[PDB]
Amino acid sequence: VQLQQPGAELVKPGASVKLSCKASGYTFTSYWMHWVKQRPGRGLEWIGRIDPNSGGTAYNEKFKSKATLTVDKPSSTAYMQLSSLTSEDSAVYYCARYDYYGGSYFDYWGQGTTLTVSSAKTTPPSVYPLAPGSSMVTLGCLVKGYFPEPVTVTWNSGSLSSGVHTFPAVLQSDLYTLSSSVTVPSSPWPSETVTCNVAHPASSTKVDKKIVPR
């Protein structure tokens, strides 16, 4: 019993997609196939559900003409097709099974598919230095506007491996941007030069940036 569904897809705006969920396990008829959409920062949204046997379906009006639930009996697969995909559709999409009302639950969830509505074409990041304007000291590198994921930011050829934090990227302008801040002690800097190391293999880009005061 494992509800397998592919982990990711890329899709251009205005297009549509069909997310498949092949139910590896004990039954289909005995269970219901619901669909849920998790977007970082706004929990879960029930899209709807479909019955294996008949095909009949009920949805969340908010997706009334966005999703289209179907099911193929010969392959124990459940599909969901979103049409006219827009920037909001970008989300993690799951297919969980329902046990009758009888114990009444969503015992086994599919791992989700990370749909990505984006017109962006491969694009290299732009490294910008983040420096203090005044004991310890926080320096940084802004890795702005890059696609696709994911970027590799390191400090001093690996030498600074602490006082370092590289946060998650944020999506906007259909490009990702993130940052790495490094707390190197107030003595080293400005004294010892501090340099951040960014690489975006998706473009095969590699850049250096020495954090200078200003």
């Binding site: 619901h34 849920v36 998790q38 970082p40 920062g41 929990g43 879960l44 949204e45 029930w46 709807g48 559900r49 009920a58 949805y59 969340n60 009006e61 993690v92 799951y94 969980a96 046990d99 009302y101 009888g102 114990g103 009444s104 639950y105 969503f106 015992d107 969830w109 791992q111 989700g112 732009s126 910008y128 230095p129 983040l130 420096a131 203090p132 304007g133 926080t138 940084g140 802004l142 702005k144 934090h165 946060f167 998650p168 990227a169 944020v170 906007q172 941007t177 993130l178 940052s179 801040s181 200003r214």
Partner: protein
Amino acid sequence: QAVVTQESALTTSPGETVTLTCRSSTGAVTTSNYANWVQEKPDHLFTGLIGGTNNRAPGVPARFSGSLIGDKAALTITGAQTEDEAIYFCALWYSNHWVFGGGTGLTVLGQPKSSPSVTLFPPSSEELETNKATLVCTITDFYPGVVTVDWKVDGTPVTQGMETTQPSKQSNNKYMASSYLTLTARAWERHSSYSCQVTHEGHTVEKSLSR
């Protein structure tokens, strides 16, 4: 067409007892909305503990237990485990549709509490020549992992062009987050006062840079 409410976040200690509510904007929760509590572990893990209000999916540590208190459905983790520090999504049934609440971020302190270290960076000079200014505000070592972020350009609170990652566990088990505020290099020279306000646990910490 119905809004199901859940607590923002809850901090319990090990060996303790904690309880999450699940409110209905349509009325008190009935047995007809089989609130089905579902757990969320980081990196998209999802398991349902309680179904049908009362029933516990098979193989759910007996300590998790469903029930109705007052007018709301309720998940009561008895003897909360450190491995319970996770997001809890509740769901309600309404005749033909289902509705998931806001979920609860539950912290199970297994380290003392820590405050956020705030750092608000100015636009790189280089970026400015690109007719762009990105205010970078970093937030590290705060625990529990829940903060609210606010900016204020010229004492005025900003309502757009600002975004913040969701708290991500640090190597230590504490949390970190990064907030951004994007501006046209032109919009930058127009204002003077800038501040990143991070509230963690109800205590605010400001960091500002005058231009």
